[PDB]
Amino acid sequence: XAXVXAXV
DNA sequence: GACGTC
DNA sequence: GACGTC
Numbered sequence A: 001x002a003x004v005x006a007x008v
Numbered sequence B, C: 001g002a003c004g005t006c
Ligand SMILES: *C(=O)c1cnc2ccccc2n1
Pocket: A001, A002, A008, B004, B005, C002, C003
């Protein structure tokens, strides 16, 4: 759920 | 070494 | 249970 390297 | 929701 | 880039 967080976006810092993938964003899901 | 750093972040959590569809 | 899914997703890695600075
Ligand atoms: C987002 O909340 C989140 C949390 N845990 C994860 C584990 C694996 C892939 C993606 C994820 N996303």
